[PDB]
Every structure is written in structure tokens, then in C-alpha cells.
Design a protein around this ligand. Structure first.
Ligand SMILES: [Cl-]
Ligand SMILES: [Cl-]
Lengths: 64, 167, 167, 59, 167, 59, 167, 64
């Protein structure tokens, strides 16, 4: 690629999450952006069905 | 969200090589107090935008535990071992929730990553480590709205080098 | 399909007691060679007919194993232990899939059964065993149509009695 | 609400090792005698690329 | 103490067949709250008397748990599955320790039984169940003297019969 | 070599969570009826600082 | 042999603080193909010389597996998570044998480290990582004589830093 | 301690290992030396009973 000047600096992403934890159904959507080669990213996740979540969000962190 | 990894030391990038088609992943996480969290994910590229579709089934979380009590604290950083099996990649890691007041609750992740390209079109990485720093930076609401950051690095064990030229 | 159990020795029937509302169950089955099969099920009663809705996520099955090679034999009968936890029922069992080469491929089921009735409307069973005999009666069409039989019994350990008056 | 012989029907949807599938099924049994039989049909994703046995406890 | 089992239904008795030479067993028991108890045992026959020599290594039991707090109740009866592997016998079982607060603390036993006779001198049993009823009859002296009873039966799943002629 | 009633004796040595202990035991049972009883005595490391139950399957 | 660790970033050294009395450790390692290896160790200081006393019980290794076939290859480097529990230290890690011809066989270590000093006399480290590079540098004989090297580093996750000041 | 000039550069160690794996009894002795603060060490292990080992030595590496 020659140099970093020719790489995409950032890339956006979108997410839909649907599931059931301990019988509780929920659905989420999310939107984010990251830097593919620097390995950093951030996203915002919104619960659209089954909120407020009756369990810790943390169990979903590696899935979103 | 494995497209966002900084790979060092020349380690091939299985995820970025998988585009434009993309890849899937599948995982069961087993918590030390009996919970299981299983997920399947599809990653696709729609023009310039990545698109994730995630299915989740979790069960057997104890009613008196940090998860169902929503008293989880924050994740410690973690390190995954990643290596080839059956012409795809396997990952495993130990993660740990630092709960309020100091106790850690641990879990074990068991993952398979599957390129949508045939293995013959890919340069497979050797055994290596993937560090993940996951921080839930803003609890905007509840319950309902969260902001999450991640930094990830693919690397070898540089701090304790081989005396034989091994990675 | 837990509505179909013969209970002996006066053991309360958590499943039959749950109608007309019904019940759900959630399970993760861990296989000794690395596979996981997770499921969630809803059981309802629509007039005269029981209705099941099932969601399944399986992962990490080895490509070279009897499951993904579709070279499994048959299930031995199994015995589940069933007991109250968190105001609902927990079950666990070991199952063994007989496979070519005199192999048994074993797995460990971790189940939660949840009545749709409040726990106060229910007579909860004490710790007991549930034997399940599961048989594929016919593979009607390769990979497409099966007929499956089950017989199930809820009981105590009658073969080896207590000397202290315990079930 | 229960009878000595009862029918049942099921719908199953899943992914195993990346393989999507959907089944329907129909059966009958004797709830009090503890016996039952059913026919399961794979309606999407057939023929299944894995042993049906891993679905036995989920029908 | 596997010489003391009532076998029904014609099931061969791997243990009684092993005399006068005897047998050994090895086991790791995993507890759901993180403890492990590993043991090795030698069984011999000295004239008229059976002689056991046992070595035990236990670890990782939580300080706050029923085991290290010495606040356990009693064992439920359990059922082991027993089958041939590697020309010897494997066993596995789930056990449940009833504990204060309506708790059951469960564990998973992984056992290998090894005859001192060559496998060619033995009639190996098919897959079957071994029920074990274990009861502490008296705590004669706190932490120092116990009396323990066991009743054991080797059997098939008689409660839920096959429709295909299987045991 | 087996009789309808047989005695047995055991010696047990172990460490659990760093705690060393040694036991001896003596019992009798009916091998064919599948029943047995024994008395276990802690000879070193008593009183045990953990539940005896974790030793039940090892006697 | 935990006395030989290079701790960076000011992480307290639980092992070196434990002298002159020393410390013990206890571990069960669970292999993915069913083996268990359990150990207990005592570490003491005799004048200027460290003295280790080790007891081992291993079981359930498959006869057809890399271990019992003596076809194990070499260990990959590994990273342990180490953190306080019950006023002592717990460790867990995933290790992986790189077998001849490329497959990895993994295992999960579960350790408790116990100082012979009371916790009140010790500065306990926070959650951190301990990298271990283990190399069997000389197979002098069989079977019978081995030379083994280890380098170890106690550190935080520096490659993927926090954006919040966490370790 | 002021500086590294006041720390022990190396420390020796000795080991005795006794055990049973899959029914096979063995005993080992070992001797080694390491650098406590550099975090490096090496040892020689000798099997004195039950050799040659009928299983891979590797399962003993984290114990010696
Ligand atoms: Cl590799
Ligand atoms: Cl901490």
C-alpha cells in the first residue's frame, strides 16, 4: 500500500442484536466508528425492545 | 468487532483479508458461577459501512450473582490466544469482571472465526495473542443506552522472549 | 418435551402444573470434544395442542468429530438430576452418544425450567431423577426427516435405599 | 387442561457451526404414561451437515 | 469401594473379576464453585481382608464456601455412567451436596477404573448405570471420626424401556 | 476369592487447600448385596478444617 | 518456580515478600481432551537455596492423545491472570502445546498461591498478567533427563491502554 | 535497596517431585539456578523412579 496515507483512516459500522438471557427477550441497535489499522473503536448501543435490561450490559460487551 | 485490530510483528490479519465478503464468528462464554452466554455473529461490508447481525442466547445466570443483580463493575483488559484449527481460527480467553468492592468474577470464552473466503485464498496467522481493552465509557441510560470503547492488538509474547527463535 | 413424564412416588409435576399458561426452558449442553449447543424453548397450549417454539445456537464442534462428520450412532438413556434453585427448577445430566469405533461422546446438560405460573401457585418437587430414553425410530430421509421416540420417568433412587429415611 | 393422549407441534430455528436451518415437527404422546413420538422435518438448510442427535433434546 | 456393588440384569462385574490381583482407580471431581478433589486409589486383597491405599489432592475450594466453612448437609444419591474406553473402564457422575439455605452444591466426577488383570482375562460390561447411596451415619467426633454407609447397584435404565431392543 | 461378608481397611493421605491430613479406616460389607459400612478416623491433621463430605467417594 | 519473576510497573511481588518463610501453591490443569493434572507444591528457603517439594496426581489422559503417546511438541508462551481472592492469590491461564505437524492441544490452569506470612504482613498486588516462556531446551535422555528454561514477567496490559487511567 | 548492586544476582534451587499419572508412579529430583529480579531460570530434572516416563514430560513443566 506504500504508506499509511493510502489506507482508510476510519470505517463506520452498524449493529443489530437480538436475544434472550434467563428468559428475558431484548433487541438492540448500535452505530459506531473505528480506526481499522490503529485497532481502536467506539459505538453507541440502544436497547429498542426489552429495556431496561434486567441484567448487566457487560455480558453483551464482546458481542455488540 | 474484529476488523479493528492493530496487528504487529507481521502477523497476518484474517479479518481484513476476508473482505469484501466478510466473516462470521460464534462463541460460548462460560462464567465461573454457572452462567452461559452464547452468540453468533455475521459481519458484512455494505459499501463503506460494516454491518453486524448478532444472535444471543444466555442462561443459567444465578439470580444472586453480579450479572442478574446488575452489579458487574467493569471488565479487566484481557488476552485471547488465537490459532488455526480445521482451516479456520479458534480463539480462547479468560475475562474478569472487577466487581464493586474488589472481587473478580471470571469467565472463559470459546470462539470460532470463519472467513467467507475459502482458506486457500487466505494467509493464516500463526499462534498469537490478541489483547482487548473494553471500556463502557458512558452509561447514558439504565438499562437502555451505552457507549463502549475497545482497543485491540494482535502480537506475540514479546515481554518473555524465546531463547530459540520461536515466536 | 417435558409435559410427557411419568412421575412415581408422589413427586409433584412442575410441568403439568404449569398449564394453561405453560413454561419455558433454557439449556447449554457442553460436549467433551469442545462443541456447545445452546437452546431456548417456549411451551404453550393452543386449545388441544401443545406448541413448542425453539431457538438453537451451536458452535465449536470439531470438523473432524462425529457430529460434523454425521457419524454418530445413538443416545444411551440418561438420568437428569432435578432440583429447585432461585424459585425455579434446575436440571443437569450427562448424556453419551455411542459412536463408531466403540467411542462414547459424552456431554453435560445445564438446564433451567421456568413455569409461567408464579412459584406461589406451584407445589415444587424435591430433588429427584428424571430418566429419559431417546431413540431415533427412523431416518426417513437423509438429513431431512426423522422420527424420534422418548420415554421419561421422574423417580427417586429406588434401587439403593436410605437407612436414614431419605428419598 | 391435559388429556391422556395429546398432540404437539414444534418450530425450530438455529445456526450450528455457521449452518442455518429451520425445522417443523408434529407428534403425539401420553402425558401421564410418559411416552411420545414425533416426526421432524428440515424445511430450510437441509440436508443437515451435522448429526441430528445434537437436536434430540430440543425437539 | 467398588467391590461392594449389586449387579442386576447379567451385567459383568469388572471389580469382582479383578481378584486376587485387585484394581486401581483415579478420579478428578470438579465442583461448581471452583474446588477440585483428585484421588488415586489402590485396591488389593490381603488374605481375607480388602485393603485400600488412597492419595488425595484438593484445591481451589472457596474460603467462603460450604466445604471450607464445614457447613455441608448431606449427599443425594447419585448415578454414575460406566463404559469401556482404552481397554479399561471410564465412569462419570454428577453428585449434589445438599447445603444450608436450600442450596445444592454440585460436582462432576471423572473416573478411570483399571483392573490389574489383563483386559483379555476380563468380561467387560456394556454401558450401564451405577447408583450410589452414600450416607454419613454418624459424626462420632467433630472433624475426627465418621461412620459412613454406602449401597450401590449396577443396572440398566429399567424405568424407561427401549423400543429397539436396547439395554 | 470373595465371600458374602468381607472386611476392609484403608489408609488415606492428602492435602486440601494446603491442609495436610491422614486417616485410617475399617469396615465391613456384603459384596454381592452391594452394601457396606465403615468407620474413618483422622489420625493427623484433625479436626479437619473442611467438610468430610468431599472425602466420601475416596474412603 | 514463582520466585523468579520480573515485575514491572511497580506491581508488588507476593512471592519474594513471603520469605524467609516461603509459600505453597496448588493447581489443577484441565486438558481439552479430558486429562487432569493436579499438583501441590511447597517452597522453602534453606540458607541461600530454594527447596521445592512437589506432589502430582494426573488422570484421564486419553491413550490416543499427544500426552500418553509422548508426541506433545513444545509449549507456546502463555499469559496468566493473577488476582486476590479470600486473602490469597488466584491464578488462571490457558496454555497450548504446539504438537508436531501443527495442531495445538490446549489446557486451563486453575491455581491458588498461599504465602506462609499472614496477609496482614503483605502488600497484595492488583489484578495483572504474568507471561511465562517455558522451553524444554535439552532432552538429554528419554524419558529420564530434561533441561527446562523459563522466563516470566508480571505486567499490566500495556499494548492496549485504558482511556480512563485503569491499569 | 538503593541499586541493583545490592540485590542477589542469582539464587539456586532444588526440587523433589513424586506422583502418579494414569496409574504410572514416578519420582524426580532436580537442580537449577535463576536470576530472581530478571525473572529467568533453568533447571535439570532427573527421573529416579518410574523412568523412562510413559507420558510427555510437558505435563510436568509447570510443576518442577
Ligand atoms: Cl502456529
Ligand atoms: Cl484488583
Amino acid at each position: 500500500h506504500g504508506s499509511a496515507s493510502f489506507l482508510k483512516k476510519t470505517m463506520p459500522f452498524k449493529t443489530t442484536i437480538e436475544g434472550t438471557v434467563n428468559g428475558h427477550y431484548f433487541k438492540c441497535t448500535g452505530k459506531g466508528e473505528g480506526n481499522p489499522f490503529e485497532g481502536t473503536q467506539e459505538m453507541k448501543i440502544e436497547v429498542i425492545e426489552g429495556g431496561p435490561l434486567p441484567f448487566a450490559f457487560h455480558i453483551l460487551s464482546t458481542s455488540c | 468487532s474484529k476488523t479493528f485490530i492493530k496487528y504487529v510483528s507481521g502477523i497476518p490479519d484474517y479479518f481484513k483479508q476476508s473482505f469484501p465478503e466478510g466473516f462470521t464468528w460464534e462463541r460460548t462464554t462460560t462464567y465461573e458461577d454457572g452462567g452461559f452466554l452464547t452468540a453468533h455473529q455475521d459481519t458484512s461490508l455494505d459499501g463503506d459501512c460494516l454491518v453486524y447481525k448478532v444472535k444471543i442466547l444466555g442462561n443459567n445466570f444465578p439470580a444472586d450473582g453480579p450479572v442478574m443483580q446488575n452489579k458487574a463493575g467493569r471488565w479487566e483488559p484481557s488476552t485471547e490466544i488465537v490459532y488455526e484449527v480445521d482451516g479456520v481460527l479458534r480463539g480462547q480467553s479468560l475475562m474478569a469482571l472487577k466487581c464493586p468492592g474488589g472481587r473478580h468474577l471470571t469467565c472463559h470464552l470459546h470462539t470460532t472465526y470463519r472467513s467467507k473466503k475459502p482458506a486457500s485464498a487466505l494467509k493464516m496467522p500463526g499462534f498469537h495473542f490478541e489483547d482487548h481493552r473494553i471500556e463502557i465509557m458512558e452509561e447514558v441510560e439504565k438499562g437502555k443506552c451505552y457507549k463502549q470503547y475497545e482497543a485491540a492488538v494482535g502480537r506475540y509474547c514479546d515481554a518473555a522472549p524465546s531463547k530459540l527463535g520461536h515466536n
